[PDB]
Structure formats: C-alpha cells, structure tokens
Design a protein around this ligand. Structure first.
Ligand code: MG
Length: 335
C-alpha cells in the first residue's frame, strides 16, 4: 500500500518498521523528506499475512529538464534486497504510486556488489549502474559505491576507540588529545553554529559550494539528540574542527565535517575518535566513515579514512534503475 502522510497512526507504524529494521537507513526515514523539503515524498510498503509491515520504500521525486520526474529512494528500500522476488513486489507498489509521473525509480541499497547479484537484477528487468559506469562526472552514481566501514562486531570486548587499533594508530589518535584538544557533543543550536562556521570555512578554503544552514536546521528539527549529534573539537578557547554523525539502524554514519584554516592540532582525528566512542557506547554494529573515490594513497580522503578503517572498502551493488520511460531514461541517463 501507499502511505498516507496525513494519517498519524499509519505514519507511526511506518516509522516503527523503519527504526526497528536491521535494514533501516536514515535516508529512508520519513524525517529525510523534511530535510529534502524541495523534493516530493511518496512512500509505499508491503504487509505479510498478519498485516505487519515487512518491507518499505521512501521515495523522493525531483524535477528534470523534461516533463518527467526523477524518483529516488536513497539507500533504500528497507528489506533484504537480495530477496529479489519480494523486491519486485515492493517495486510494483512503488511504480503504481508514482502513477506514471516519473521516468525512473532508482534505489541504491548498501548491499555488497557481486556478479551473481548484478546478473539476477538484470534478469529481472532492472538496469544496474556500478562497475559499468564512469567513476565521476554527472554520469557517475549519486552516492559513492566505495565506503570505508568499520565493523565493530569484530571487537566484542572493545571498551574505547583505542582498543580497535594497532599501536601505531593508537598513537595517531592520542596525539590531538595530548596536545590539548577537547571534544563536546550534542544537537543544540550553538553546536550547529559551531559546525557551520567550520563547514563553510572549509568550503571556502577548497573553493567549493556548501549547503545552507537551513538544511541542517531542518535536519536538527527532524531528528532528536539520540539520532543526530554534532561533535565539536576545541583547544584552549579556539574552534578547530567539527563533524556531524547520524545514528540509525545498525550504524552511525559520519556525514559532514568542517575544519578551520591553519593549525588544527589534528582535531579531525579527535572528532573521529569520539564518533567511534559513541558507536561503542551505544553498541552499534557499524561506524560508516563515508565514501572514497579511489582506494589509493593519491586520495587524501582515502588516506584519512584508511587511518580508521584498515579493512578493504565495502563495494556496493550501486544504482538499481526500474526504467519507466525508456526514451527519457536514455536522454537523461548514460554510462
Ligand atoms: Mg520538468
């Protein structure tokens, strides 16, 4: 069925399925639509013989240069996507709800890539975009397929961040704290302002754009302090670096960062260490440091994140496209 957002009871049922599913994704929670307030929300789900929700998909529709809409379910749907027959059923419900307004329904679940899975998907009619498309550009996948994920379940006895790493890394993580770096966290407006100054400063230094503060304010309004948390690193009165992490389902996700110019005393490591501590304190299975464009020492993002993730990057199946309008699809989507 399609979710009626004007019905509190139905919304709460939908939310409880999302929050409690081991496949839950924050970008699939209904709060996400509030963040992307410029997109149109359309949500659907499936029920079992008992009438209990067993699968869900939160879509967001965006405009294009054509008369068709772009339907996107960021990191969805919420279910075991390898159970393709069930996925087909969920997608059929999604397609019905789209009522022919979109040229495609794209979803990029965080499930490992494999030739076998890629083939099954293609056999069921879906168009997949992974090892077959450009690494970057506007033809590249929206989300990175390579992500540095720290699997905390490999260290059941771990009490603090340090217990997760070799001595060489313990030293790197200790350095900022030894040099006076202190980190406080929460989800207050003051902390948001703190994050925003470092976020935009970082943006300017790199000559890149940045999202407006209202984006993060909507995020702060949508998720409580047990879901959204801002970490701020300071040294003797000076603001050094910050980071935003979201806790949902089986993982804490490092989504945004900021750092002032000049001497930052390795504050970014301190921020990471505390986000990891939060994952440990809450018994979270995974700490997702985000994507990388290449597992190479020529990539500064890979370098940094490799400090905290020694395992190889997880490679996801990529974008799964249910083509609805083939002509427009070909015009707006290429490899
Ligand atoms: Mg248009």
């Amino acid at each position: 069925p399609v979710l009626n957002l004007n019905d509190p009871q139905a919304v709460e049922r939908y939310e409880e399925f999302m929050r409690q599913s081991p496949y839950g994704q924050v970008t699939q929670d209904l709060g996400w639509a509030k963040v992307k307030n410029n997109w149109e929300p359309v949500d659907v789900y499936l029920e079992d013989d008992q009438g209990a929700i067993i699968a869900a998909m939160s879509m967001l529709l965006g405009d294009t240069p054509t008369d068709k809409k772009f339907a996107y379910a960021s990191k969805g749907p919420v279910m075991d996507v390898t159970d393709v027959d069930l996925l087909d059923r969920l997608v059929d419900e999604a397609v019905k709800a789209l009522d022919g307004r979109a040229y495609v329904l794209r979803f990029d679940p965080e499930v490992a890539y494999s030739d076998e899975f890629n083939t099954t998907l293609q056999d069921h009619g879906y168009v997949t975009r992974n090892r077959n498309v450009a690494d970057a550009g506007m033809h590249a996948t929206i989300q990175p397929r390579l992500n540095m994920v720290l699997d905390l379940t490999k260290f059941p006895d771990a009490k603090t961040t340090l217990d997760l790493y070799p001595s060489k890394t313990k030293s790197k993580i200790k350095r900022p704290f030894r040099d006076g770096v202190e980190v406080h966290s929460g989800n207050s407006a003051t902390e948001l302002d703190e994050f925003f100054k470092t976020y935009t400063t970082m943006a300017e230094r790199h000559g890149i754009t940045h999202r407006p503060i209202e984006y993060f304010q909507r995020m702060q309004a949508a998720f409580d302090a047990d879901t959204m948390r801002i970490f701020v690193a300071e040294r003797e009165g000076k603001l050094l670096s910050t980071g935003i992490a979201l806790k949902y389902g089986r993982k804490i996700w490092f989504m945004y960062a900021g750092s002032m110019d000049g001497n930052t005393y390795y504050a970014p490591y301190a921020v990471q260490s505390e986000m990891i501590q939060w994952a440990l304190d809450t018994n979270t299975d995974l700490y997702d440091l985000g994507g990388i464009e290449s597992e190479s020492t020529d990539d500064s993002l890979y370098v940094f994140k490799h400090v905290f993730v020694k395992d190889a990057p997880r490679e996801y199946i990529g974008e799964i496209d249910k083509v609805l309008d083939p002509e427009v699809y070909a015009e707006l989507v290429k490899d």
